[PDB]
Symmetry: C4
Subunit: 476 residues, 4 copies
């Protein structure tokens, strides 16, 4: 009976501690920000965007991946809508490197314009038979503008020129070379039998230049994760997401230490033995252990620290985030697995503390909530523009009247491009890691130490006794 151990212990939150400076042999610009979450999941920056309908849609998942992070597409939409959202992220870069779009000569140019405008593409590979996939040509914009009547076989108006192709598996470096020698923009990839396997474009090559640290899969396509809950349509949902290309699924739950959740997760794992599973939230060592034991690959920590979260107020449950991460990370290392610090982070400095306490990555909602990419609804008050930001446990989100919320509905100032937000936080992360001499996150877990501060020390830590009219892009 814990009646005699009713008051267990004290917990620390980001504002109770500071990282202590230490000898350092690594400059901020040379710290390694990569983090491997699972065999299949390694990110170039320890940053992940929350699965919230006001933060992560395909645009955000695309922007955070290009920056080297991971986006988790929210499940507050139909399985079909969420899967298509996921496909959009996979189709972004090297979109058709595999599983290309294509039509037959039989089809009508109209159908070609249908998919050229639906998936927004300059050309459509044309194969003899949808089943044979033997490349016979390709229809392009130039072709569509020359064409008068679209109600005709895409054949009559074609490109039966001397097809220039490359073997399956040619990389971007060699394709760029081939595209340059032939003054072309699209390079179809076919096997030794002329069967179409995919297509490489000049843009793909350019995007590699534009976003050098993008987190991508084996095919050079941006990584993406998607969330699902523990309901009757979970499998259906999970299989639709994986089939759309998801590199991992996130079983998002309010209480991950629930028998039911553990039951469903084991069933999900039993069905997807190879896939990467990230699971719901816990804030204790046993909760992390229960989830790992259930087959999860990555455990997300966080009960109540959310900016828009009212769990601690309405249910009276939770644990200060720095302590929760730490207690859970003790198990993550026992199992040689990973953890995501989820919530309560408001400053770049908080990210370094969350990582130093044992996190392998942090999930951010509030910090991205008002960007160009975030799906939130724009509002104007006092002339300034805002972006709605609501907890998934709020009334509006839990919608299709109030029905016992664990979160609130709010809004945050317009922040502009997410790439800028990310750039500001990485600088703080690199500086933080430079101060404690951590060349990589591993050293951070092993060497970084905290000094506890009081409310006054927190005051000293923030700028004080000075009137600020123009704030820093990394401080309020």
């Amino acid at each position: 009976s814990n009646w005699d151990t009713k008051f267990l212990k004290k917990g620390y939150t980001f504002d109770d501690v500071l990282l202590i400076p230490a000898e350092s042999h690594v400059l901020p610009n040379e710290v390694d920000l990569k983090t491997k979450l699972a065999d299949n999941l390694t990110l170039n920056i320890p940053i992940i965007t929350a699965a919230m309908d006001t933060v992560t849609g395909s645009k955000m998942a695309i922007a955070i991946a290009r920056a080297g992070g991971l986006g988790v597409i929210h499940k507050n939409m139909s399985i079909t809508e969420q899967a298509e959202e996921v496909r959009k992220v996979k189709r972004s870069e090297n979109g058709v490197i595999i599983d290309p779009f294509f039509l037959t000569p039989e089809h009508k140019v109209s159908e070609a314009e249908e998919l050229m405008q639906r998936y927004r593409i300059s050309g459509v590979p044309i194969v003899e038979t949808l089943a044979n996939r033997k490349l016979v040509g390709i229809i392009t914009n130039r072709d569509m503008r020359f064409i008068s009547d679209y109600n005709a076989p895409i054949s009559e108006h074609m490109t039966s020129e001397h097809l220039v192709t490359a073997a399956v598996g040619t990389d971007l470096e060699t394709a760029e070379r081939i595209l340059h020698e032939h003054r072309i923009e699209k390079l179809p990839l076919v096997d030794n039998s002329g069967r179409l396997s995919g297509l490489i474009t000049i843009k793909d090559i350019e995007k590699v230049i534009e976003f050098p640290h993008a987190a991508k899969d084996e095919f050079g396509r941006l990584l993406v994760a998607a969330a699902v809950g523990v309901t009757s349509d979970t499998f259906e949902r999970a299989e639709a997401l994986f089939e759309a290309g998801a590199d991992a699924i996130v079983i998002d739950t309010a209480h991950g230490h629930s028998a039911g959740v553990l039951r469903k997760i084991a069933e999900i794992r039993a069905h997807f033995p190879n896939r990467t599973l990230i699971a719901g939230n816990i804030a204790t060592a046993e909760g992390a252990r229960a989830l790992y034991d259930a087959g999860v690959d990555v455990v997300k920590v966080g009960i109540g620290p959310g900016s828009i979260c009212t769990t601690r107020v309405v249910a009276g449950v939770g644990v200060p985030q720095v302590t929760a991460i730490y207690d859970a990370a003790a198990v993550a290392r026992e199992y040689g697995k990973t953890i995501i610090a989820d919530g309560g982070i408001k400053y770049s400095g908080d990210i370094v503390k969350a990582l130093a306490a044992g996190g392998n990555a942090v999930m951010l909602g509030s910090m991205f909530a008002g960007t160009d990419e975030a799906p939130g609804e724009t509002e104007i008050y006092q002339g300034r523009k805002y972006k709605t930001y609501r907890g998934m446990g709020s009334i509006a989100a839990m919608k299709k009247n109030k029905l016992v919320p664990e979160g609130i509905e709010g809004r945050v100032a317009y922040k502009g491009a997410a790439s800028d937000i990310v750039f500001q936080m990485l600088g703080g992360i690199r500086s933080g890691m430079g101060y404690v001499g951590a060349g990589d996150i591993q050293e951070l877990h092993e060497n970084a130490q905290f000094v506890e501060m009081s409310g006054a020390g927190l005051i000293e830590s923030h700028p004080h006794d000075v009137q600020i009219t123009n704030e820093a892009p990394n401080y309020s």
Copy 2:
């Protein structure tokens, strides 16, 4: 001499702790909210409304009982007024299942309309003799509208039809059946000699449907408690209340660890050996022990935590509520008795903490203070409507000029129906208990543990860094 133990120890209040999540095998919707306070007192929800003249009158006592709770009628009124207030609660449902109203043929229809409008009833059972109680008929509204001159014997204008009755003790299920077969709304209950014992109505049956979790007595009448102090008119008051139907009395005192209070309580118990006694406030283990030893059944904990309480400021006395509940609950279990956590609760989450620290029920004042049912006086400021809320130790309350107050006078925003307030708090209670895996309050005492948080952790616990224009019905 405690001079060497002047600084005894540290105390915790609701905002210093959080309940730690734990493995759970019970969903929120299946947690058991019942709580037995005494052999005679079991509630369907661990909620009780404060004995304050701005919170609990008969309307509130009726609403909280229908929801499964208990209302404590305040004593800031004459003994006669408080007793009638109590009768109103007993007469609400199955109001005349026993001790029915009745008149004789002799009486004048006028007297019948007198009691039909005083107690608001559609019919008046008519007996041959007030002493014989032999049912001879019943006068109804239809009868009153047909009647021209009321200054006449209720006989001349009557209902000497074929009386349809049921034996004493027939339950609502069988009465409903009888009422339906005879297309009637009132079913008189008589003994084998035709003597009237009570009456069952169609509404009674309907109210059982409308409020399925109502806390009721052996007769299916809503439960109710009433408060009394320790003065010379206490006995007179207590006996008037019990005689009106009170299921328990609350000896409400500022300092329950007083020799005088203990003296009076023992005298009250010596006189009412069977009755359920709930007693004044204490905040220590010895105070609870002194009261239990004096014969009390349920001890209420709380010295100074009240929203409108100034005891800690003007007298400088008190103890942080979570510690007080806990220290007292240690004794409650030694004696195998119960405790009510009284005051300082502002959020549904606080209720779960109060219960987890050892409370068997919580008493709420502020949270109900501005509802439809609360007796407070309405005020308008800035266009919005408010409801006065004053401590019973304030000047105005202590009235029939300032006379050394231990509390203040205030007001709170209009909250609408109390049933809605209750519904919001139960949801939070069920979620809280779900997180720690407590299927019932007992498991809550035995298994739930607290983690201590600092001021910063409290900040993290509440929503932050987000502009809220539309709040949740369960958070501010």
Copy 3:
């Protein structure tokens, strides 16, 4: 070297602790508020008014004494002015019970009106010779109105009636009897030789009725203390004050643990071996010991807690008041001497904590600062009236430009009569002592215990979550 004990320990201030309720056998109205500070100094209430030029002049010293307390006349004025201020307090009640005013027949009625209007009196005892003091008569208002030309011997216009007198030493009870039988208002007291020793009046008898708990000396005259510093004019000042009637002097210093102060105090004691000495401020056990060892009777505790004090901010020195009182009171009991808790008290509850931590009395400045009696200057802002309140270490006070202040200049709202302020605080003191069961201050030191509270607990202790538009006379 304390370099290894640089961080000595933690200190508590009034807002860190609460008194724990305990069994009680004494009602608030029967608690004993008396406190003996020294053989010569016993007060009826443990309250003393600060020696500040904006708080204690003769009017305040008179009002607090009538209530049973002690007033300390400030030294921010000439020795002559301070002594006369002191005489005014002694002349208030039984003003001429000894050392009466008197003139000879020789004098001119003009001189009689001079002193009748200077000291405001209805009559002037007239003696044959200033040196003989043989009562020959008495001139009264009635006499002055009958008199046309004042430039004449008070003899020509006289009262050589049958003198009614009483022997030296007759008390008020017997004098009242004599005054009543002779229908007179003034009763001269003479020795067996007709020599005038003093005079008793009807008012004196009435004032005993009006203020039953007044703190008075052996002659039934109100008690009074006066402050002096440690300078070259100290002796001159101290002897002028004692000669005016001071029952005690207060050697007020910023740092009482100074070699110089201890030197001067010992010299003051060596010169006044019988007198009651109260000395400067200390906040440690050794400081209290140094002062006691120097010959002081009562030590006042307090370095930095003052509402208008900036010592802790500008010098960075001080110790939380509850800890200081306690550390010093440990020595006070070793020496069997007393302590005054000086400063930082803002609520009546704070008084009980200060007494419970070891204080024998508390000195209040801020709480009396805006009363009728306080010498502060009235100011009007937003229509409301204020009363200036400045620390004696502020610039303005240290005046005859800024010259390195240890305190600030401020103002407080007009509070009305001090008797009302006192009445509100005693009620809280009696309630506080009732809760812990302390029948007298001694039991308070021996039995009362503190429970430590956090910032949150402090929040819980004060009224919260309620809009207050009309405050209590004992809370803000």
Copy 4:
């Protein structure tokens, strides 16, 4: 692995502690404020002005030195500009006591007016040959006004009078005597061969009177320090500064516990074996040790406490200042070296705490930021005048767009002359040291102790419950 010692310990900031009063045998006006930082560096007051482009230029370095302190000229300017800034401080008093300005008869009066107006001087010593330096005369204002055409040899218009001189090495006391007997204002110093070595003026003698406690070098010239970073132009910079007269250089770094910084410092020391080196910031015992071991003479402590500093927020790194000073001072004494408490000081009381925790001097930025001398830019808001104050890590400062700041840009109210600010802080320092009985800073380290206070105690420490409309020059 510190993974098991992740939460190292608690840190204290100025607002967590208070100095405890102690027996004292020294009055404030007799405390010794001198502090020796190095063999070559002893200040008359433990105060140094921050190397910030909005706080310390030559004017400030001049004012703080005259007061007995040390000014550190910031490096946010070209090496040439910073060196000239430094020369200005050396030329202030006894400006030409050595290395005097001079011209030949050959030169044109025009060139004489060029340097008389560039360096603002009443006269120009004239020597036969720039290489011989044999004094032949001196041109003065009177001479320039008599002269019509400046395009002529300074010879034609001269002062070949009977030259009055003094031997090299004559002090101000004897020079004053010589200047007085000859009714002259400038006294050339020449060797036994008539070679000019320098010049003493009446003003120099007057400035000794005007600023009696000025911190000066062996030649009676004000002391001055200058900052440099760890870059490729450091040596060039350091040698330019020393050559301009710098008495010490400050290697200012964000993280002084960096391998690179330690490398550069050792190289700087290896090159300047005699010079006084003050180095970057650390907040740990090892960091101080690493720097001392690298050859630094004085270590400055402080990571994150700055008013305009955001290091703790954006990087999440730092340590409460009182703890940092103390941990570092433990090493300073092991090595018998010194420390400068850098940042987080807002009140004079904070200076005493910083010194008591082990500092030998404190560096102040914010407190001087809006003075006459501070280089900040003036701004007007609401009619009042402000002075910009920005962290050297802010965007604007890091300028020649945002580029990952560790500090912010702000402004502070106009404060008037710095001499007044200094005067207010010394008074508080002397009072603070008087309370703990510290006759000098050494006793402060050895005897002073701290008592820890809570948030409430901090409240008690500051003025409270009083409306202040006119603040003290030493408190807000």
